[PDB]
């Protein structure tokens, strides 16, 4: 029931927390705290949209959640989805105010069409996040470029 906090010296990455942070460990400014978004792509992670959707699914009853992150990495593949329900209305919610596309994509799978939309929101089946511009959401937003990813919290040196 506690979010891990990474502590780095020169290159010592020890997964600690304040449930350990030795009385010699120095946190002198809040500027030393950073959150980072890392991408989930590479070998064994399919890139084409038909294979990619297998990692996501529609679900109702679960409210979407957002968390900020301050830095991330260049993504080789990003996604940008637009989906009409069978009756023609919109399947994905509009991007909330201040949520912009993931800012550094080599390539964007930007696609549009219609589908069954069997739920209120599209989630990540592996429990990862959809990374947008320094905001990570549990959910896919309409016409908005994302990378798949996860977040870590760090203490940086002075």
């Amino acid at each position: 029931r506690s979010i891990p906090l990474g502590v780095i010296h020169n290159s010592v990455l020890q997964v600690s927390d304040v449930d350990k942070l030795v009385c010699r460990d120095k946190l002198s400014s809040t500027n030393q705290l950073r959150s980072v978004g890392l991408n989930l792509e590479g070998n064994g992670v399919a890139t084409d949209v038909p294979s990619a959707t297998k990692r996501w699914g529609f679900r109702s009853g679960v409210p979407p959640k957002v968390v900020n992150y301050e830095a991330g990495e260049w993504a080789e593949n990003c996604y940008n989805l637009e989906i009409k329900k069978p009756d023609g209305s919109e399947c994905l919610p509009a991007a909330p105010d201040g949520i912009r596309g993931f800012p550094r994509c080599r390539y964007v799978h930007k696609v549009s069409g219609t589908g069954p939309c069997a739920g209120d929101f599209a989630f990540h089946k592996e429990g990862a996040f959809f990374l947008y511009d320094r905001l990570a959401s549990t959910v896919i937003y309409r016409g908005t470029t994302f990378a798949e990813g996860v977040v870590a919290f760090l203490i940086l040196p002075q």
């Binding site: 949209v49 038909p50 959707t53 297998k54 996501w56 699914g57 529609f58 989805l81 637009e82 989906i83 009409k84 023609g88 696609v111 549009s112 069409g113 219609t114 589908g115 069954p116 069997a118 599209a122």
Partner: protein, 215 residues
């Protein structure tokens, strides 16, 4: 653009049986093909349920027999079958031939929880642009060629559409080319016997979802 076609290949060596089919009780609808997702309007007779019923009609016509002397005359006895014996399928000019006159091909669908990547809509939109294609480049990769082994040009099997927007069609045209047999009285007799049965079947075909006429 239609008589040019019946005057280059068919007449006077080939007679044509022709139906016009409308769907008076059916709404037009709007579909978004992957991956562009643009709104594409589809006319009443391009509704999927209508197409299955038109194909029911068309298959029944193919199965129509007539008695002549001690013979049973089929459409296959008297039809233009361009790839005989090799391929004995009668030439049918019909939008259903983009699906090779098959219910299951018409229902071919590649989709998941998110998109429909390919279906009869996208196969239609592609096939009317490239009727001679063996592969519609979709995830379904279905052919466009009719069962008789040749292309079905969209302006011969549709009507009521604006410009080149075939998807807006409000009528389907189905054309069965039949040998004229001007040179051959006995084959002619058999062709006329079949023709009489076909006119009568089609003029009292009972399906209120369809309006079937001639010319």
């Amino acid at each position: 653009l239609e008589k040019e076609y019946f005057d280059q290949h068919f007449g006077p060596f080939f007679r044509t049986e022709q139906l016009i089919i409308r769907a008076p009780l059916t709404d037009k609808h709007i579909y978004q093909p992957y991956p562009s997702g643009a709104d594409v309007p589809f006319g009443p007779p391009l509704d999927i349920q209508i197409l299955h019923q038109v194909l029911d009609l068309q298959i029944a016509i193919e199965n129509i027999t007539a008695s002549y002397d001690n013979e049973t005359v089929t459409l296959q006895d008297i039809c233009l079958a361009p790839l005989s014996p090799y391929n004995t399928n009668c030439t049918i000019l019909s939008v259903l031939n983009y699906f090779q006159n098959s219910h299951s091909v018409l229902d071919h669908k590649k989709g998941d929880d998110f998109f429909v990547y390919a279906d009869y809509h996208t196969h239609f939109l592609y096939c009317v642009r490239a009727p001679a294609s063996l592969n519609d480049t979709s995830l379904l990769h279905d052919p466009c060629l009719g069962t008789f082994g040749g292309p079905v040009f969209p302006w011969l099997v549709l009507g009521g559409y604006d410009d080149q927007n075939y998807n807006n069609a409000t009528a389907l045209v189905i054309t069965f080319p039949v040998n004229n047999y001007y040179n051959d009285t006995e084959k002619l007799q058999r062709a006329q016997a079949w023709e009489k049965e076909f006119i009568n079947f089609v003029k009292n075909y009972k399906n209120p979802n369809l309006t079937i006429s001639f010319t």
